[PDB]
Structure 1
């Protein structure tokens, strides 16, 4: 059925890219199909199953954004207000002029991609934030940043008067039914934890780091993410505030060439060519500052769009795609960091083969 469309494309993808294992969820109106492929660990040959946990890396940022947006709904966080307002430890710094909205759309004044080596903890981090000088016009330039989204998650935590991961647990994960979603994988589940594989074919597993939780830290299943995507597509039974919070994450906030930057979710109007999609996942978009223009009639979630998000670690490769107007979504997790082109193409082929595009 679905499986007849899906299975040969994933088989071809897994061969062409030498991916040990994948887990795939297709959300549609009529229900969700979970499919598992290959080995969770290439060495042992243990198959991927219902309980296999994958690093999603940068995909974690959508959870961070969801929780942020939920603090905003509850009236505890204002997205427009300066960050120093909820983190007063940063008064007098650049963050008097940078907002939570800026942080969730990567328009926080050129905040770099990585946490610098010198920053080894929260104190050295806040100190680094205090000193840092912007290198690009705030709100007019997009630079993909772990420092920024992470700061959004500190700010959100602060404003809800709690710590990040337990607050995320109670307010987003648990209500969505995402009990296989872990920031720190418990001892009992380690046998379910997929082993990753880099582009030279080496075993690799993410290491702890500052802001790992807020930026790239989740390990989870395809089904759990299907629950988030399900909510986004309004096919879930969810609390009304959480549902607004989730919907608010899909508001277009800035234009960046062909791409509309929402709250971490990136989107494109239909019809869209795969090349455009590839451009959005490429060096030019990810590793360079790109002019951004704030959307002034600020856009309600659209229903004629490709909404997507990539996630990688050194040994894992994930991608989510949502077509809100067809109530259709795709979660593909892999335990190999395989190129973003292969992701967009496999996605497109899948969704086109199903007739969603």
Structure 2
């Protein structure tokens, strides 16, 4: 059926990229198909199954974005407001002039990609935010940042008078039915925690770091992710306020060349050539600052677009594509950090093989 298009491509991908295991989820209007390939851990050879848990890296940011969007829908968070309104420990800093919307679109004034070594806890972090000097015109330039979305995670928790992880579980994960989604994987499920493989073939797992939960910390199953995707595609039964929150994550906020930056989500209009997608998910977009044009009346969720997000850790590589107009989406989790190029090619072949493009 569906699985005839998918199995040869995945096989080819895993062989070409030396991927121990993958878990894939295809979301269609007539149902969601889950598929498991290879081993959860190369050394032991344990198969990937329904319960297998994957690091999703920066894919976590879609969750963070969603919870931010819900606090907005509940009228507890204004995206246009200075971030210091909700984190008064940052009054007087650059964040009097930087908004939650900026942070959610990586247009917060040049905020760097990584958390500095100097920063080792909340106090030292807030301190650093207070000290930091913007290096790019706020709301005009895009630099992919963990400090940025990490801070939006903090701002959101503050505006909801709760702690991040429990709030996330209560307001987003539980209602979406995401019962296998963990920030800290419990001892009981450690057997189901896949082992990573880095690009030198060594086994890796993610270490704790500051802002990990907010920026890259989730471990989960392809099915659970498929619930988030199902909701974006209007294929799930979900609270009205939550469904508004999710939809707003897909609002166009900035034009960045061929890419439109939604709230975390990144999208390309259709039809789209793989090269556009390789470039948009490549070096010039991820690791350089890019001019960004504010879409002033925001722009509603589009039905003629390729929406995606990549995510990685040293040992895992995830990718999510959504076609809102075709009510189709794809989740590809792997326990190997393989190139974004390969992710884009695989996702593309798969989706045209099913005539969603």
Q: Equivalent residues in 2 for 1:244-283 (5 A)? A: 244-283=244-283
Deviations 1:9-55 (A, max 9, x none): 00000000010000000000000000000000000000000000000
Query: Which secondary structure does the structure 2 equivalent of 1:23 belong to?
Result: strand
Instruction: Return the alpha-carbon distance in structure 1 between the equivalents of residues 62 and 356 of structure 2.
Output: 23
Instruction: Return the alpha-carbon distance in structure 2 between the equivalents of residues 36 and 219 of structure 1.
Output: 16
Deviations 1:118-148 (A, max 9, x none): 0000000000000000000000000000000
Query: Which secondary structure does the structure 2 equivalent of 1:234 belong to?
Result: coil
Query: Which secondary structure does the structure 2 equivalent of 1:226 belong to?
Result: helix
Deviations 1:93-136 (A, max 9, x none): 00000000000000000000000000000000000000000000
**TM-score normalised according to structure 2 size:** 1.00
- The alpha-carbon deviation at position 297 of structure 1 amounts to 2.5
Instruction: Return the alpha-carbon distance in structure 1 between the equivalents of residues 62 and 82 of structure 2.
Output: 21
Instruction: Return the alpha-carbon distance in structure 2 between the equivalents of residues 302 and 312 of structure 1.
Output: 27
Deviations 1:41-88 (A, max 9, x none): 000000000000000000000000000000000000000000000000
Deviations 1:162-211 (A, max 9, x none): 00000000000000000100000000000000000001100000000000
Instruction: Return the alpha-carbon distance in structure 2 between the equivalents of residues 306 and 179 of structure 1.
Output: 28
Deviations 1:241-300 (A, max 9, x none): 000000000000000000000000000000110000000111110000000010022100
Query: Which secondary structure does the structure 1 equivalent of 2:185 belong to?
Result: coil
Deviations 1:220-253 (A, max 9, x none): 0000000000000000000000000000000000
- The alpha-carbon deviation at position 159 of structure 1 amounts to 0.2
Instruction: Return the alpha-carbon distance in structure 1 between the equivalents of residues 185 and 210 of structure 2.
Output: 17
Instruction: Return the alpha-carbon distance in structure 2 between the equivalents of residues 297 and 169 of structure 1.
Output: 32
Instruction: Return the alpha-carbon distance in structure 2 between the equivalents of residues 302 and 150 of structure 1.
Output: 27
**TM-score normalised according to structure 1 size:** 1.00
- The alpha-carbon deviation at position 90 of structure 1 amounts to 0.3
* Correspondence 1:19 to 2:19: yes
- The alpha-carbon deviation at position 150 of structure 1 amounts to 0.4
Gaps of 5+ in 2: none
Instruction: Return the alpha-carbon distance in structure 2 between the equivalents of residues 151 and 119 of structure 1.
Output: 14
Instruction: Return the alpha-carbon distance in structure 2 between the equivalents of residues 137 and 224 of structure 1.
Output: 38
Instruction: Return the alpha-carbon distance in structure 1 between the equivalents of residues 144 and 298 of structure 2.
Output: 21
Instruction: Return the alpha-carbon distance in structure 2 between the equivalents of residues 63 and 115 of structure 1.
Output: 20
Between Structure 1 and Structure 2, how many residues are aligned?
357
Query: Which secondary structure does the structure 1 equivalent of 2:297 belong to?
Result: strand
Query: Which secondary structure does the structure 2 equivalent of 1:276 belong to?
Result: helix
Query: Which secondary structure does the structure 2 equivalent of 1:355 belong to?
Result: coil
Instruction: Return the alpha-carbon distance in structure 1 between the equivalents of residues 75 and 323 of structure 2.
Output: 30
Gaps of 5+ in 1: none
- The alpha-carbon deviation at position 305 of structure 1 amounts to 0.2
Instruction: Return the alpha-carbon distance in structure 1 between the equivalents of residues 146 and 51 of structure 2.
Output: 28
Match of 1:189 in 2: 189
Instruction: Return the alpha-carbon distance in structure 2 between the equivalents of residues 285 and 129 of structure 1.
Output: 24
Deviations 1:143-163 (A, max 9, x none): 000000000000000000000
Instruction: Return the alpha-carbon distance in structure 1 between the equivalents of residues 212 and 134 of structure 2.
Output: 23
Runs of 4+ more than 6 Å apart? none
Instruction: Return the alpha-carbon distance in structure 2 between the equivalents of residues 90 and 342 of structure 1.
Output: 41
Instruction: Return the alpha-carbon distance in structure 1 between the equivalents of residues 320 and 283 of structure 2.
Output: 19
